[PDB]
Homo-oligomer: A and B are copies of this chain.
Amino acid sequence: RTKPFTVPILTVEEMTNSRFPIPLEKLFTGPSSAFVVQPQNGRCTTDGALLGTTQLSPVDICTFRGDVTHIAGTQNYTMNLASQNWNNYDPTEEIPAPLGTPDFVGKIQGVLTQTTRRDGSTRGHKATVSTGSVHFTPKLGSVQFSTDTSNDFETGQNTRFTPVGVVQDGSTTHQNEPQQWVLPDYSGRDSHNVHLAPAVAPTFPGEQLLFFRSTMPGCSGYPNMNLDCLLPQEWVQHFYQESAPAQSDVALLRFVNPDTGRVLFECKLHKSGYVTVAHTGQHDLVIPPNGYFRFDSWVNQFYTLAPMG
């Protein structure tokens, strides 16, 4: 027989969000027809193929690196993206955007660090990247940071953005941003995003997506810090390493409590790489902190899940 499939033995708290570099916290399910579940990070098939902008480093997510140039008489800088390894980014390559690029619309605040090469002198500054901005054009090779300085950064020198969290306008309706289910225009206004990972949805009666949820840090304002990924990053890493051929439509998983030794709920991990659970309504799952997922068997699509309590 073929290579056995498995998922990591890791508690939810032991794993990482695949869409922002922070730990998972809780499992969340709810209905999803009023939005588009089409995230591009944390997207991998159960047999290890990365889709969208998904990539293996759990820290290089929503980071940017390249050289900056100042925009005259503003406190903003244009960055020319270079690849993860400081190599040139190629925009003709059949991906939506540099791997790791943010896949939601909001203003991400972090720090831009720079090292001057001739002498090893370094500088760092609060900087914010706004992914809705018309200047957010990562697939063209360039994005824009609004910072708190007009003089410090130098041209031609390696600069790095390190994400911290998200902001929203105080006056504007609380929680009105970021919008975790709207993809940016990776090439800017009036262009189609390309090579995207598919949108996903439940396709069985009584079934809803299962989200692995973190809370992004807020830096300023009343932002909506909710962040759902469809696979923990370690799952991506796992499937990529393991490459077990999917035997059937869906991989049945049991979420077990090690303390009582019983199954708490079951769920389907679809081969294209997302999880559905049997439940109607918005629900914050209650799990033991030391519960874990374990693969059970390959079943076909029409397998009926026991309702999740």
Contact = CB atoms under 8 A, between A and B. Distances in A.
A113 B217 contact: yes
Contacts of A59: 16, 21-23, 58-59
A13 B221 contact: no
A58 B58 contact: yes
A61 to B, nearest CB: 9
A115 B237 CA distance: 31
Given A113-B219, A162-B164, A85 B121 contact: no
A133 interface: no
Contact of A85 (B13, B85, B119, B219): B13
A60 interface: yes
A109 B164 CA distance: 12
Given A14-B56, A56-B14, A85-B13, A121 B222 contact: yes
B122 A218 contact: yes
B113 A165 contact: yes
A57 B113 contact: no
Given A57-B14, A113-B219, A237-B234, A121 B170 contact: yes
A173 to B, nearest CB: 12
A6 to B, nearest CB: 10
B164 A113 contact: yes
**Interface range, A side:** 35 or more
A23 B221 contact: no
A167 B125 CA distance: 13
A120 B175 contact: yes
A121 B23 contact: no
A167 B175 CA distance: 35
A156 interface: no
A109 B84 contact: no
A223 to B, nearest CB: 6
A53 to B, nearest CB: 16
A162 B217 contact: yes
Given A122-B217, A123-B220, 5 more contacts: A10-B56, A121-B221, A121-B222, A124-B219, A126-B126
5 contacts: A14-B57, A16-B57, A109-B111, A111-B111, A122-B218
